[PDB]
Amino acid sequence: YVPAQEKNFTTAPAICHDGKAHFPREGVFVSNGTHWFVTQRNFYEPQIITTDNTFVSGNCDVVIGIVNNTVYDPLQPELDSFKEELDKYFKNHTSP
Amino acid sequence: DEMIAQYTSALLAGTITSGWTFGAGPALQIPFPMQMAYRFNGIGVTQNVLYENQKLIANQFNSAIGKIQDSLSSTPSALGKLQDVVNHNAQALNTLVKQL
Numbered sequence A: 001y002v003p004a005q006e007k008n009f010t011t012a013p014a015i016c017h018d019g020k021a022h023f024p025r026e027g028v029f030v031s032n033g034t035h036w037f038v039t040q041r042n043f044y045e046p047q048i049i050t051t052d053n054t055f056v057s058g059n060c061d062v063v064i065g066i067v068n069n070t071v072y073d074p075l076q077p078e079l080d081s082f083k084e085e086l087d088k089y090f091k092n093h094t095s096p
Numbered sequence B: 001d002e003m004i005a006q007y008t009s010a011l012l013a014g015t016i017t018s019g020w021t022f023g024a025g026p027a028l029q030i031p032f033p034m035q036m037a038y039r040f041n042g043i044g045v046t047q048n049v050l051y052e053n054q055k056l057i058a059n060q061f062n063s064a065i066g067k068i069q070d071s072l073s074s075t076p077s078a079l080g081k082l083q084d085v086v087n088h089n090a091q092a093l094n095t096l097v098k099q100l
């Protein structure tokens, strides 16, 4: 196996979202200027940043490379269809 | 001894900037503070041992290199493996010129 032609990007070694640093499970974060992605090491396959492939280790004021963006969790794909569904159906009893 | 010193000044210029990727085709740039986080990951300890302790790890690396400088100049018995290469050859010819 031999890798073919390449393409350069911009990086940062960690992600701080809620005052805590986030480190990638495999790969390291890249971006093209607008929004960030996590990628494999030997093939450009961008993926959205999610809790499933990021682990937290301490707060984000101990290492020089920190950038600001959002990190996702696999529950708001569910809870936004669940908690908002639960919250909306309970508002029709307070009206009368 | 000049172009030999240029070959071994190109291995150090690729293992610092590109890492290990220039031994398998195209050479890919990588920061050195991030390449070190991949050498720890291949041992068994996670990435956060380096980034959370980037200060004292840097000082241990610089001081260890400076201790090498005094260790080589402490004695002349450290380079005995290379001296026996030229000593075995030089005394092999002196025995040959006294066979006459």
Ligand SMILES: *[C@@H]1O[C@H](CO)[C@@H](O[C@@H]2O[C@H](CO)[C@@H](O[C@@H]3O[C@H](CO)[C@@H](O)[C@H](O)[C@@H]3O)[C@H](O)[C@H]2NC(C)=O)[C@H](O)[C@H]1NC(C)=O
Binding pocket: A032, A033, A034, A035
């Ligand atoms: C960096 O790469 C990302 C990844 O492709 C680029 O984001 C992409 O931006 C385009 C518009 O600029 C998005 O297209 C739009 O998508 C929405 C929703 O999907 C759709 O409703 C619109 O009609 C339009 O097709 C595209 O989805 C989006 N890709 C992702 C994965 O979010 C970004 O623009 C790149 N930035 C630079 C500076 O190159």
Ligand SMILES: *[C@@H]1O[C@H](CO)[C@@H](O[C@@H]2O[C@H](CO)[C@@H](O[C@@H]3O[C@H](CO)[C@@H](O)[C@H](O)[C@@H]3O)[C@H](O)[C@H]2NC(C)=O)[C@H](O)[C@H]1NC(C)=O
Binding pocket: A066, A067, A068
């Ligand atoms: C990512 O976003 C966070 C959230 O805003 C940024 O934290 C903010 O950092 C700045 C400077 O690092 C803080 O300003 C500070 O204000 C105090 C009081 O005026 C002043 O004494 C300090 O010298 C400093 O200027 C700001 O308060 C802080 N926001 C908070 C804590 O909510 C962080 O800097 C962002 N990271 C990057 C790389 O931009």
Ligand SMILES: *[C@@H]1O[C@H](CO)[C@@H](O)[C@H](O)[C@H]1NC(C)=O
Binding pocket: A092
């Ligand atoms: C609330 O219940 C009443 C029952 O008479 C129904 O007419 C109304 O559409 C309901 N509103 C919502 C928002 O579900």
